[PDB]
């Protein structure tokens, strides 16, 4: 034979993908789970790069082999679709190939190994379904106080359990907004969290509004106003220019004079439009002229200058108003009077250390809130506040995709068991396809518990019996649903616990996990040229 | 390739410890010389820690963020640069419950920090308060930098040179005491003098030359303008070069150059100021205007400069020079001062009171000598800035380390479970900074340090510390050796933070 490359083929060729793709899982395995360990990246410059994140190291690990290029164009589709447990899904797709190539070596045929893993991820799917809850916990039951106790355990503001959470629960339920076909998620940014050293580290306190850290300038205004009216502009008050890169030169001395007057005149017709509209809170995120500031006292309006333009966003949104972009109609200046206006009851200004923050309370429509940690220590309270914003996303997370599944392991020890007894019902060379596929899913209680400092063996055995005696008889003697604890290195119940994960996860990681170890293990022949 | 296991947490441990024993003898007054080859054959026998491992080239990962972690450690603190590598590389040197007894990093990470909680509420404990008002009291606690140095003669006033500067710096409103050296405390080598000529000005101060004989000389009341734009021909907005070469496009240039640089020194010279600083250059056609009006041109000047001579004689900064208003004026400063010093001119915007900032002089006969003033000064001033933080001394000499080692022995008994193993081994671990002392004296290593276990079980453990001159033990009351307490508690965080750093990491791949 006389070509122009190389071609093999054989087990070999099969050994070689396997053994390809386990070691891209044994990079992110020990990396699994919020204990998982760092891991340095190191660049051809000479750079270093350090997190734990499974999908981030994939995105930047470079490692040339066919199979491999495979696995990491898999994570790419499940952070497009989802964006979690990308790290899973490499793992099981390794273990799968672990398995089936242990099969080949007994003269099991590939197309029936692949046939038991699409019958077996089938009747996955199915069990789940089962086992699964809907959103719950929103009314008449509370254990979803313990919901965020759970993450606030690992932290030091989880002193007081029910104190710090009790407030969080209040702040997830009052942001909840439609917006879209009777849909309503919790979006992300809603709720200002700051910190405060005053007394003691038990005056941390609930706020309904929108916190707006800004100044009132000179003394002439009044620092609380009922007035209702809200005016919203991004317009700038002071000098207007052509640009600030294209700067007109003023050859003509008396036309310098003449200009100065015209800025100063066209302000005072738009600083009557303003005040025609008889709103007293004003928000300007262009800046308002030290001119136009003495024109505020006479009516008594309370008006900011440098409004931050993302203060604005969350402020018309609370008041229910619209932003107005600039007073240009194409025509002539004009404020658009009963539109731009916002509504709300009672807007004062509040005292805190060494910032001052203006507190619009009581809107028409706002679905939003504010919380003020008042601690001890600049160390103590600092850790507080990223410790409520991560255990708020948990109790979004949770109360968003409706449907959600106990975490902590507890979804592949339960269809370990089921599926293994589901082998012996079909036959016809699809048992040893499909007995894998249930000692293959028990890696991810496997990696948890290696994490977690423990003995993998004894928790895993704990877990398998658990599960068991949930499918021999439905009485409620047998545990059901039972995770597993990093922290104390022990079985728990996720459903008290509250430790879930949306539905949509684990479906999606057993499915895109399936067809990887399909596609790898299709390739029989390695052509090159 | 690629390095896992537990041999990436093994050979984290050689690289740490290699980069450590290197700089052992070069802790103390009696710290060892090491000499390094160049590759032309210099030789460079210097015994700083910091100038050391900057010329040294490692190549593994771990050493290079052990060297980069020291490196931002000095330019917060001036000093305990060394002791940080010693005591991070001593922690990571116990590799017995790592490898031997296959404990997991977690656990032992878990044993660091419930210890680093207990090391720094013990300094607190066993410190000292200080009094600042004392100019004697301050002047002690200055002298261990300043010994073995050229400024030990004029020392007495190189000490209210930095004692003075630091103070103007602090901000005692706020609450918080923040100090910037670098921005407000800048100092620049002025040539000519002698050490004693070195004295304190307030003021920004500007070492730009005088061109041209016409400038203002002394000034009553100054007036100084800003403005961000620069003086020369105007430039389109595309990318378009100017190269000047046939006369057809000389004589059209300059003309519009000549009218467009008048235009906007006109509404310079209408306020009628005594001096003009641009942030841009000025080129000559705009230094012919400015002359005219008989005042000092300034061209070539930063944004943060500006932002200091602004807040110094109460100016305004303007975006162009033909929106130039009345408002902007240097009311308010001291006097504006040409005059040449050290065959070099000077700009004098200074002032008689405290702008929020200061301007230090330097005054010597050569640049040998102002070299060598100028660091002396620099980690001078770093000294009386951790001081005025927080005014809390701390036993040195290796008393404070045998001082918290006593306290977490004590405390370990009560500690029940697998992490009191590790617990301990911290303990231990601070006696390495004792061990070097005595170690460079010559005296024997086993028979102090044991009869100075005893004394902290007995007396206190604020005194009985070890004498870097002599050898012997000694107690820190009669002795200068008394260190300041914010060097030592980021001395100790650090070293533990480094410490897990290292451990954190099970994996090393490469990547892109």
């Known amino acids: ?99 089936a190539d242990e099969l080949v070596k007994q003269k099991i045929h590939p197309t029936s190994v692949i046939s038991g893993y699409r019958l077996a991820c089938k009747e996955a799917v199915r069990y789940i379904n089962e086992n699964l809850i809907v959103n719950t916990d929103e009314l008449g039951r509370d254990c979803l106080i313990n919901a965020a106790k759970t993450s606030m355990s690992s932290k030091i503001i989880g002193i007081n359990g029910d104190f710090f959470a009790n407030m969080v629960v209040d702040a997830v339920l009052a942001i909840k907004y439609t917006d879209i076909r009777g849909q309503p998620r919790y979006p992300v940014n809603s709720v200002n969290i700051l910190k405060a050293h005053g007394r003691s580290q038990m005056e941390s306190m609930l706020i309904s509004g929108y916190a707006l850290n800004c100044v009132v300038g000179s003394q002439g205004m009044p620092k609380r106003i009922v007035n209702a009216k809200i005016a919203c502009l991004d317009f700038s008050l002071q000098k207007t220019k052509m640009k600030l890169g294209v700067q007109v030169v003023i050859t003509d001395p008396e036309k310098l004079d003449q200009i100065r007057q015209r800025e100063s005149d066209i302000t005072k017709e738009r600083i009557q439009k303003i005040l025609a509209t008889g709103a007293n809170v004003i928000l300007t995120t262009g800046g308002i002229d030290d001119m136009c500031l003495k024109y505020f006292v006479e009516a008594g309006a309370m008006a900011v200058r440098r409004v931050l333009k993302r203060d604005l966003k969350r402020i018309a949104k609370a008041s229910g108003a619209t932003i107005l972009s600039t007073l240009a109609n194409l025509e002539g200046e004009e404020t658009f009077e009963a539109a731009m206006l916002g509504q709300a009851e009672e807007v004062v200004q509040e005292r805190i250390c060494d910032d001052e923050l203006i507190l619009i309370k009581n809107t028409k429509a706002r679905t939003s809130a504010s919380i003020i940690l008042r601690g001890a220590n600049d160390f103590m309270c600092d850790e507080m506040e990223r410790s409520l914003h991560d255990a708020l996303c948990v109790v979004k997370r949770v109360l968003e995709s409706k449907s959600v599944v106990p975490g902590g392991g507890a979804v592949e020890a339960a269809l370990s068991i089921y599926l293994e007894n589901y082998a012996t019902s079909m036959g016809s060379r699809e048992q040893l396809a499909i007995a894998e596929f249930a000692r293959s899913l028990l890696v991810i209680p496997n990696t948890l518990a290696v994490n977690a400092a423990q003995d993998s063996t004894d928790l895993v055995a704990k877990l398998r019996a658990f599960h068991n005696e949930a499918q021999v008889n439905p009485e409620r003697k047998n545990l059901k649903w039972i995770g597993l604890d990093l922290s104390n290195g022990k079985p728990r119940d996720n459903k008290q616990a509250g430790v879930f994960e949306p539905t949509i996860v684990k479906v999606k990681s057993l499915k895109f996990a399936t067809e990887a170890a399909i596609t790898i293990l299709r390739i029989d022949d390695l052509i090159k040229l | ?221 100054p007036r100084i303008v800003l403005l961000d734009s620069s003086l020369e021909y105007k430039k389109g907005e595309s990318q378009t070069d100017i190269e000047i070469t046939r006369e057809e496009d000389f004589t059209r240039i300059l003309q519009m150059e000549e009218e467009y640089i008048q235009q906007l020194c006109e509404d310079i010279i209408q306020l009628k100021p005594d001096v003009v600083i641009t942030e841009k250059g000025i080129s000559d056609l705009a230094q012919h205007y400015l002359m005219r009006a008989n005042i000092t041109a300034i061209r070539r000047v930063r944004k943060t400069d500006n932002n200091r001579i602004a807040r110094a004689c109460g100016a305004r900064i303007v975006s162009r020079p033909e929106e130039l208003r009345e408002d902007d004026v240097g009311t308010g400063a001291g006097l504006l001062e040409i005059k040449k010093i050290g065959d070099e001119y000077f700009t004098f915007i200074t002032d008689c009171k405290d702008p929020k900032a200061c301007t230090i002089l330097l005054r010597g006969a050569s640049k040998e000598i102002l070299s060598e003033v100028e660091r002396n000064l620099q980690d001078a001033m770093q000294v009386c800035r951790n001081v005025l933080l927080d005014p809390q001394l701390v036993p040195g000499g290796g008393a404070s380390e045998m001082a918290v080692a006593h306290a977490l022995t004590e405390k370990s008994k009560a500690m029940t479970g697998v992490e009191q193993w590790p617990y301990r081994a911290v303990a231990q671990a601070l ?82």
């Open chain 2, 1 to 221: 390739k690629r390095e896992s296991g537990r041999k990436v947490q093994s050979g984290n441990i050689n690289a740490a410890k290699t980069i450590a024993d290197i700089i052992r003898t070069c802790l103390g007054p009696k710290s060892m010389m090491k000499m390094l080859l160049d590759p032309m054959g210099g030789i460079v026998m210097t015994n700083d820690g910091n100038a050391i491992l900057r010329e040294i080239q490692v190549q593994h990962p771990a050493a290079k963020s052990m060297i980069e972690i020291s490196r931002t450690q000095d330019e917060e603190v001036g000093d305990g640069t060394t002791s940080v590598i010693i005591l991070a590389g001593e922690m990571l040197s116990v590799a017995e419950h790592f490898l031997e007894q296959q404990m997991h990093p977690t656990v032992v990470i878990s044993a660091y920090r419930k210890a680093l909680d207990d090391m720094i509420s013990t300094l607190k404990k066993i410190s000292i308060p200080v009094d600042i008002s004392d100019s004697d009291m301050m002047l002690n606690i200055i002298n261990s930098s300043i010994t073995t140095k050229a400024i030990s003669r004029w020392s007495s006033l190189a000490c209210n040179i930095a004692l003075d500067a630091v103070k103007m710096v602090q901000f005692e409103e706020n609450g918080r005491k923040e100090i910037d050296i670098k921005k407000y405390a800048r100092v620049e080598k002025i040539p000519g003098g002698i050490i004693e000529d070195s004295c304190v000005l307030r003021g920004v101060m500007i070492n730009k030359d005088v061109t041209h004989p016409r400038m203002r000389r002394y000034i009553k009341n």
């Open chain 1, 1 to 99: 034979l006389s070509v122009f490359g190389d071609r093999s083929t054989g087990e070999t060729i099969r050994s070689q993908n396997v053994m390809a793709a386990a070691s891209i899982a044994n990079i992110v395995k020990s990396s699994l789970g919020p204990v998982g360990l760092d891991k340095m990246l190191v660049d051809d410059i000479g750079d270093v790069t350090i997190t734990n994140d499974g999908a981030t190291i994939l995105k930047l690990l470079e490692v040339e082999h066919p199979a491999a290029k495979v696995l990491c164009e898999l994570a790419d589709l499940q952070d497009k679709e989802v964006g979690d447990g990308t790290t899973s899904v490499v793992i099981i797709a390794a273990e799968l190939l672990k398995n």
């Open chain 2, 431 to 512: 006696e390495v900074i004792p061990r070097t002392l005595i170690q460079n004296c010559g005296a024997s290593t086993i028979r102090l340090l044991t009869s100075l276990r005893a004394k902290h079980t007995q007396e206190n453990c604020e005194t009985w510390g070890v004498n870097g001159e002599t050898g012997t033990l000694v107690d820190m009351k009669e002795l200068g050796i008394w260190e300041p307490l914010a060097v030592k508690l980021q001395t100790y965080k650090t070293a533990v933070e480094t410490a897990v750093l290292l451990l954190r990491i099970d994996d090393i791949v490469s990547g892109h």
